[PDB]
Amino acid sequence: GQMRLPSADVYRFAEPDSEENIIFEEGIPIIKAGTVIKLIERLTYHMYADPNFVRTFLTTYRSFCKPQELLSLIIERFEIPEPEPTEADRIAIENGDQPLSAELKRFRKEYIQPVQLRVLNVCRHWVEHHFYDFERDAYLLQRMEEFIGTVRGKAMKKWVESITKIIQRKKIANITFQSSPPTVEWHISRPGHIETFDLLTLHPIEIARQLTLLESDLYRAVQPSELVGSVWTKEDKEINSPNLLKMIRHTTNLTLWFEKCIVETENLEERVAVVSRIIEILQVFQELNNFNGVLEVVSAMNSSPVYRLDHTFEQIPSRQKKILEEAHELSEDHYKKYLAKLRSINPPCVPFFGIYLTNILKTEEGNPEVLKRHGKELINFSKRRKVAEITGEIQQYQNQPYCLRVESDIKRFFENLNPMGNSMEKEFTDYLFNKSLEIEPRNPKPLPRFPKKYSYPLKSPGVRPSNPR
Amino acid sequence: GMTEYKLVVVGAGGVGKSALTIQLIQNHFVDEYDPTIEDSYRKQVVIDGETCLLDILDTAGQEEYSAMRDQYMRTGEGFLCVFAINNTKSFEDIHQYREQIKRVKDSDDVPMVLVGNKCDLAARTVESRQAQDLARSYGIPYIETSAKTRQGVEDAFYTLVREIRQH
Amino acid sequence: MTEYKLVVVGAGGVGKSALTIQLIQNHFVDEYDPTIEDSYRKQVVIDGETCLLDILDTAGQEEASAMRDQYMRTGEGFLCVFAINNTKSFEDIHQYREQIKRVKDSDDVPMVLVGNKCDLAARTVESRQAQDLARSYGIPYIETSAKTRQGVEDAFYTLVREIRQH
Ligand SMILES: Cc1cc(Cn2c(N3CC4(CNC4)C3)nc3c(-c4c(C)n[nH]c4C)cc(Cl)cc32)cc(C)c1F
Numbered sequence: 001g002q003m004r005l006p007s008a009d010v011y012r013f014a015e016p017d018s019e020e021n022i023i024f025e026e027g028i029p030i031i032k033a034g035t036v037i038k039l040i041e042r043l044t045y046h047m048y049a050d051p052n053f054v055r056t057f058l059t060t061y062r063s064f065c066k067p068q069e070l071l072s073l074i075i076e077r078f079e080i081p082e083p084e085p086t087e088a089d090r091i092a093i094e095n096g097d098q099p100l101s102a103e104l105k106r107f108r109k110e111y112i113q114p115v116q117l118r119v120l121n122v123c124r125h126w127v128e129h130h131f132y133d134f135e136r137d138a139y140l141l142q143r144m145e146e147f148i149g150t151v152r153g154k155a156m157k158k159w160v161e162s163i164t165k166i167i168q169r170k171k172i173a174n175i176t177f178q179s180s181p182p183t184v185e186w187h188i189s190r191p192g193h194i195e196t197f198d199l200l201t202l203h204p205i206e207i208a209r210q211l212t213l214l215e216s217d218l219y220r221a222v223q224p225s226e227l228v229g230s231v232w233t234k235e236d237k238e239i240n241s242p243n244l245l246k247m248i249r250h251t252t253n254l255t256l257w258f259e260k261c262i263v264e265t266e267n268l269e270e271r272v273a274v275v276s277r278i279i280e281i282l283q284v285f286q287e288l289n290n291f292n293g294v295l296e297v298v299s300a301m302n303s304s305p306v307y308r309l310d311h312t313f314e315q316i317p318s319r320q321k322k323i324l325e326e327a328h329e330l331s332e333d334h335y336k337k338y339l340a341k342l343r344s345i346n347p348p349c350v351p352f353f354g355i356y357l358t359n360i361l362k363t364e365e366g367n368p369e370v371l372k373r374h375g376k377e378l379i380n381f382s383k384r385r386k387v388a389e390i391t392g393e394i395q396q397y398q399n400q401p402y403c404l405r406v407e408s409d410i411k412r413f414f415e416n417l418n419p420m421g422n423s424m425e426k427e428f429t430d431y432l433f434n435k436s437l438e439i440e441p442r443n444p445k446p447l448p449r450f451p452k453k454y455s456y457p458l459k460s461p462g463v464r465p466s467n468p469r
Numbered sequence: 470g471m472t473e474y475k476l477v478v479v480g481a482g483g484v485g486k487s488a489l490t491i492q493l494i495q496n497h498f499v500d501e502y503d504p505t506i507e508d509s510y511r512k513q514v515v516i517d518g519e520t521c522l523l524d525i526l527d528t529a530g531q532e533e534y535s536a537m538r539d540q541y542m543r544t545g546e547g548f549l550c551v552f553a554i555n556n557t558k559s560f561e562d563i564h565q566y567r568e569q570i571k572r573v574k575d576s577d578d579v580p581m582v583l584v585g586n587k588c589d590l591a592a593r594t595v596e597s598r599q600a601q602d603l604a605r606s607y608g609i610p611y612i613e614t615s616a617k618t619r620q621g622v623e624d625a626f627y628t629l630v631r632e633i634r635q636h
Numbered sequence: 637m638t639e640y641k642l643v644v645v646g647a648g649g650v651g652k653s654a655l656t657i658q659l660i661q662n663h664f665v666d667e668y669d670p671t672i673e674d675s676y677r678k679q680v681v682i683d684g685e686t687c688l689l690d691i692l693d694t695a696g697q698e699e700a701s702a703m704r705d706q707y708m709r710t711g712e713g714f715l716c717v718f719a720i721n722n723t724k725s726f727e728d729i730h731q732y733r734e735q736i737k738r739v740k741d742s743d744d745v746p747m748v749l750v751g752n753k754c755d756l757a758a759r760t761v762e763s764r765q766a767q768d769l770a771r772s773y774g775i776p777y778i779e780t781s782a783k784t785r786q787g788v789e790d791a792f793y794t795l796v797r798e799i800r801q802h
Pocket residue numbers: 275298299301302306307308309310312313314316321322324325328
């Protein structure tokens with residue numbers, strides 16, 4: 001038969017399942033809703049491990065349970081009473097013999113040790129992947145250190161001593177590749193001559209590579225703590241979502257820089273060279289699976305100041321119009337082709353983050369925190385699972401590093417890019433649109449001519465890489 | 470077959486804007502949503518006896534991608550300009566959203582509605598007379614909606630479709 | 637995108653976690669932090685087909701030895717890892733092989749035999765002995781180093797191919 005359990009009066013996690021405390025979705029069960037006690041029981045269940053539930057729960061639990069309360073509950077879960085001797089054990093002891101203790105040994109092996117190990121696995125994952133709870137609450141860390149440091153008994157000892165060391169390392173806190181990265185490419189600007197760096201003087205291949213390294217690093221730095229609770233939209237967004245906002249502000253600045261490069265090139269022939277170079281950068285972004293970069297270019301080309309430059313458009317080669325068209329088509333029909341492409345490529349890649357943000361926000365706004373059943377309020381866990389499916393997808397693309405060499409000066413150039421200067425956003429985007437009107441006036445005003453501004457050759461070196469010995 | 474209308478929701482973030490489309494497209498009568506589901510933003514409706522398909526773009530959550538606004542807005546035939554009735558700044562933002570829509574569409578007469586959204590029980594700071602006066606100064610309808618009871622939601626979208634049909 | 641459920645099994649300390657983290661992050665873990673149970677995901681194109689690998693990284697310490705049926709039921713294919721400088725870990729392989737066969741009630745479970753730590757000079761398990769065992773199981777034998785990446789992709793992606801052809 002099944003193992004008997006402690007009385008639910010001395011150990012709360014032995015209460016029977018019912019629809020008043022847990023609801024399953026229609027080979028392990030999937031939880032739709034439950035009390036916090038039932039969620040923690042299933043988080044640390046004696047019959048099976050559920051590592052994706054551990055991640056889901058530790059990512060999302062703060063919407064229904066405070067960190068201090070979670071720790072109290074898993075300590076309570078850990079402290080399992082052992083059963084008393086059975087009648088057969090009693091009779092053995094009365095005869096001066098050693099009892100077999102069969103039921104006690106089974107309960108230790110099949111209930112206590114798995115539940116206790118799974119509690120420790122929650123602690124291990126909490127410290128390793130959600131350490132911000134402890135960075136923000138020193139007393140919580142003290143409690144965790146004390147709990148782990150006072151677990152007795154040899155069955156758990158290896159993991160207790162390990163988790164103690166992991167905590168101490170987290171308090172004070174290298175890549176290998178299948179091949180060598182390709183050689184850094186140079187065009188008009190030569191190494192060390194940062195003062196000449198610009199859109200047309202750096203090599204377009206290397207512009208795309210260094211922006212991809214920068215944008216990959218920005219993508220990889222965003223933690224789930226910046227996303228759950230929709231905190232990047234709320235009044236404290238600068239406190240709670242700083243890496244996400246840095247990533248978005250880079251994307252915005254690059255889009256505006258592309259627009260500024262275009263409309264501040266008043267000579268038509270030179271402006272065609274600028275737009276053609278930006279489409280070449282887009283081509284390399286596509287080759288690198290940098291979808292953030294792809295959309296940075298698409299957003300610039302579809303902006304009000306650039307979109308209307310029909311005289312510039314007319315001179316762009318057909319093959320480049322086709323590249324831009326197929327990049328824009330990724331975004332059509334609610335990103336249908338983008339989503340399919342992201343799921344088909346071989347990483348590394350840089351996803352576009354905005355879709356994830358909208359899906360997390362709408363999942364949190366469109367589903368209730370609790371379900372009411374039989375007069376009880378149950379935590380709606382399905383809603384949290386949906387959010388954690390999105391954060392899990394984000395994390396999956398954060399693992400793979402690009403095999404590209406950093407160029408420190410080109411990296412610094414793009415880190416320090418500031419197209420708006422000291423101007424406010426409305427000021428600056430009105431300026432860009434007025435420049436567009438200046439360089440290609442609305443019909444029927446005649447098209448003026450403008451002097452050249454670039455003293456160096458406009459011919460692109462192209463985007464196929466070179467390889468000397 | 471039936472006409473499809475591409476509608477675009479615009480407005481300040483962080484103040485419950487997304488509730489408007491969620492409540493519309495929702496299983497009206499089950500409070501639940503999966504936005505990742507292909508066509509959680511398409512809805513067949515009958516407006517004044519004429520069946521049509523609404524395709525709604527709501528990029529709620531992407532407000533910091535400010536250089537993408539033109540890209541997103543360009544797709545739309547009609548616009549819901551949404552502010553929160555307890556957030557004066559979101560109401561003051563409306564003028565610039567409308568100017569940006571006019572520029573992207575290259576038209577002084579773009580179908581649009583002004584929507585005042587009640588997103589919580591915090592005290593109202595934009596009175597309905599202020600919003601009516603603003604809408605009248607623009608020549609567009611004003612609709613107030615609740616983010617919790619679905620009141621006004623159908624009216625906001627149907628009124629916009631009528632603006633498109635009567636353009 | 638087909639999803640594949642891979643499970644990494646073997647004695648404590650043979651490098652199951654280091655192998656997995658090398659595959660997932662291109663990083664070698666120097667610490668020895670005994671695993672309870674960890675899970676990873678990886679999108680990757682193998683033989684021109686995109687898939688999604690779900691990788692379960694299991695506990696090798698003997699204190700967890702009674703908790704294995706639950707993960708063996710879920711797995712589609714198993715990396716059976718020993719360390720080439722640890723003869724006891726090689727002798728433990730057959731216990732994992734037999735338990736997997738029992739739980740899945742099958743003589744034909746996708747498996748790859750992995751001899752890890754092949755960057756170390758002081759080998760105590762000869763390749764021939766491991767290859768003989770692999771042949772008796774009908775499975776390939778791949779020597780790996782989580783430290784240098786030697787053989788790591790080959791081991792995991794060979795297991796995917798096994799599951800695909802099952
Ligand atoms: C090359 C180029 C493009 C634009 C602006 N633009 C234009 N053109 C503006 C008109 C209207 N009269 C011309 C068409 N088409 C696009 C496309 C696109 C292409 C291609 N095929 N299909 C699509 C949807 C994609 C994107 Cl993102 C921007 C687009 C502006 C300048 C200065 C350019 F050089």
